[PDB]
Write a protein that binds this DNA or RNA. Sequence first.
RNA 1: UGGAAUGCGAGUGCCUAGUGGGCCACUUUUGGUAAGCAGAACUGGCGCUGCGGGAUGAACCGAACGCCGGGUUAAGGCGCC
RNA 2: GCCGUCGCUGGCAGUCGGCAGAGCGAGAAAGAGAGUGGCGCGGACGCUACGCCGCGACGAGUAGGAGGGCCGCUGCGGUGAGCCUUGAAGCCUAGGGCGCGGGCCCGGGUGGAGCCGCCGCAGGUGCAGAUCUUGGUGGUAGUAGCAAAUAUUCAAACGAG
Lengths: 147, 104, 52, 187, 128
Amino acid sequence: PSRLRKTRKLRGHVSHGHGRIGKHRKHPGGRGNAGGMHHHRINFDKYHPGYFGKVGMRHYHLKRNQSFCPTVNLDKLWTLVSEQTRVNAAKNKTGAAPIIDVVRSGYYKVLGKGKLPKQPVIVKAKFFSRRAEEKIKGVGGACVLVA
Amino acid sequence: AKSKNHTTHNQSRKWHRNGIKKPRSQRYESLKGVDPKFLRNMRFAKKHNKKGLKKMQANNAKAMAARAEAIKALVVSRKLHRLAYIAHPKLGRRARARIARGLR
Amino acid sequence: APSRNGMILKPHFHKDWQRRVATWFNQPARKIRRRKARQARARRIAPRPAAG
Amino acid sequence: GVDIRHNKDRKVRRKEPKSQDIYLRLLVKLYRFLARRTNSTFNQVVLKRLFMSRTNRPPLSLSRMIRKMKLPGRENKTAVVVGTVTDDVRVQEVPKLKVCALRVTSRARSRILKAGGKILTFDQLALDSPKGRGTVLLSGPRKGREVYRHFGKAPGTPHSHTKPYVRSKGRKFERARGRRASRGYKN
Amino acid sequence: AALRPLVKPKIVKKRTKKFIRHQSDRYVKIKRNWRKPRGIDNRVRRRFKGQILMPNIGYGSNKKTKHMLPSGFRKFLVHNVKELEVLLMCNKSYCAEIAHNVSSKNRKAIVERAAQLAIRVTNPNARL
RNA sequence: UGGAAUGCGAGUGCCUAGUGGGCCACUUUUGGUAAGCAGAACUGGCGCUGCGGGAUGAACCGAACGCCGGGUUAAGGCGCC
RNA sequence: GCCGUCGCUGGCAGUCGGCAGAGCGAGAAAGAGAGUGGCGCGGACGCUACGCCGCGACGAGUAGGAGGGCCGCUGCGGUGAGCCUUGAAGCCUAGGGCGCGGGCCCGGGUGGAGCCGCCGCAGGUGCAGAUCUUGGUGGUAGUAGCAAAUAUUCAAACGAG
Ligand SMILES: [Mg+2]
Ligand SMILES: [Mg+2]
Ligand SMILES: [Mg+2]
Ligand SMILES: [Mg+2]
Ligand SMILES: [Mg+2]
Ligand SMILES: [Mg+2]
Ligand SMILES: [Mg+2]
Ligand SMILES: [Mg+2]
Ligand SMILES: [Mg+2]
Ligand SMILES: [Mg+2]
Ligand SMILES: [Mg+2]
Ligand SMILES: [Mg+2]
Ligand SMILES: [Mg+2]
Ligand SMILES: [Mg+2]
Ligand SMILES: [Mg+2]
Ligand SMILES: [Mg+2]
Ligand SMILES: [Mg+2]
Ligand SMILES: [Mg+2]
Ligand SMILES: [Mg+2]
Ligand SMILES: [Mg+2]
Ligand SMILES: [Mg+2]
Ligand SMILES: [Mg+2]
Ligand SMILES: [Mg+2]
Ligand SMILES: [Mg+2]
Ligand SMILES: [Mg+2]
Ligand SMILES: [Mg+2]
């Protein structure tokens, strides 16, 4: 609201907070990003390294659906199934492992950050990282590849 | 037109408003810039420090026992001084009682 | 002019954008109009399913 | 005339919460009294953190509270945070905890209680621990915010690992000149 | 013979003249309401000797006699009999002022009730 | 025996306006016959600052300022104004 | 002496009363501790804790920043069993006052129909300037002036002239 802003406090103060010497003039320095390679060079180099120039290949007609690959780490793996799924498997004696289907939860690749609980599991997924596969195998699990 | 060229007038006045602070000092200084060959070995020295862990425990316990053993075997004016004693809230507690008993 | 740290911004307001501002104050009116036509269509085609 | 500077006379520090919350201010009335009329420095620290702003009161995750309440000698001590206790899905087992917090998220409440723990409010801490005895005061990570990635030496200086402000992230967004020696320079 | 306050301390005013605005004697367009002069060369703003004075917190009144009427009371505007009764328990420090827009009919009742409650009225003889 | 004196609470982080024409003096100092000229160093000023004194005066001398009473002073004064 | 600012991140929930017992400012840590053996019916104020109270230091300010306004203007939600033809707004006033101030209250007059306080919301919200816009009015001033082209006079009439 306008009643809480500086203008109400700047009534009677001539310059309105812009100074008597420099004044508030229209566009000193240029408009927008003018001067980036010129009188504004220090700001751009100091705060925006890399801004000027070109790097890497072009790709025409990029379709971001083709590279769709949501990832999940192993430390969040057991959140995809219910809590009773884990405890029932942990306490059961037959040794049956539950199937966790990451694609059903909306993930494609499984990544290795984290530590799994000491509990066998069967993991279905399109992709696995190397370390994810070993951590899943270290607890007695198995990796299953889906398409 | 022509204008002034250069001055440092008023500059030491500005530098000292927030003080000319010396660089901050920490007990551990970074190993950036030290000899790469020397640093490579210092990392190898740190890496295998755990090899001699058991020997240090044995020596430390041995030293502690010896250290403890030796230790266990080893082990203005009289008026103003009197008055300063009486006025002491603890030490003069009984001396003050004697005066009170005498006064009555 | 840039001032200390910040983001470099390129607003697309270099045309006569105020000549083509589409407000949405008729939005409640549209919702009532579309709803009133779903009902009038459902009555017309009853008992055929209203969805289609 | 006296030769003195006045620029530092006024100390910038909160004497109260900016919040108008009437329940928070009732707790400040409570701990204003306890801090004043008891010699317990714990009360002073809690009174100070009740004035603190939202970013000076980071949330404490469940996993981090378990770690700090598992160090030796901290059995049967009430964990205290002037902030929010958030749940951590990366934890498998929750021990029996006694915690005092301003807020505990709905899922953190079920997990703490389901393990046999007790969740207090700060008005209940005062009645149980008037001087703060037998407590473990805990704080969330203050630098655990996205802003602190952008602070420090400006990104375009040597050995500056500060994060820049880019509208988008990608190969076309601030990566050519100044970020690789092949384009002008790197530093 | 009027009601007296609980105490009547001496009222000390640091200043009794008003702070008239600069150059407000020279023009009609400049009213005497105080405006802080802000011109660069303004000699009143620079506190030159012999010039119009400026208000500053030093002129503040003693907190014990501030807002105190010469009679020793402090006023409190009232619009009806009901508002008047709030002064029942502070009738020795606060008097009643009836608002200007209260009709002559209603002033009789407010003045009549105030006498019963021993509340002093600043303007009891108005609109008779 | 916290290992000289003296004084003093410190550290740290974000956001940030105006400014980016200056000018003057002691001392040092370049050019110039010199300039109330041009150009530097140091510190202090004026700029942003009233007040006592120098009749008068941006900068000199004293002294820096909330609104008052009493006392005493600084630099300067005490024929009369 | 008084005002404010800052500091003490100072003190006060103990107004613990006849279900009573009044203290914790003092040079020098920690209990006005608890126990086990050897007539009257009484006692000020306080505490909107966003309150109240104490002690000490301090107070120049352009550009510029920040805070607080029970400063002011218009409208909106609430509230004031608000005000008002027994007189609203507005306006005027050598009337009485309050506030450091922005301002405000009351008295008297004119006026003739609406208006305000408080908690919140909102803004086309505060003028001395801009050779500012529009309208009004001054001094100048009964002044410059009513001087290009030769020229009028007598009598009578109408008529207030
Ligand atoms: Mg200013
Ligand atoms: Mg500004
Ligand atoms: Mg200007
Ligand atoms: Mg400028
Ligand atoms: Mg300029
Ligand atoms: Mg601009
Ligand atoms: Mg220059
Ligand atoms: Mg700028
Ligand atoms: Mg002073
Ligand atoms: Mg200052
Ligand atoms: Mg400051
Ligand atoms: Mg000037
Ligand atoms: Mg020169
Ligand atoms: Mg200037
Ligand atoms: Mg200065
Ligand atoms: Mg001066
Ligand atoms: Mg002279
Ligand atoms: Mg004097
Ligand atoms: Mg003389
Ligand atoms: Mg000041
Ligand atoms: Mg008049
Ligand atoms: Mg009419
Ligand atoms: Mg409007
Ligand atoms: Mg106007
Ligand atoms: Mg005007
Ligand atoms: Mg004439």
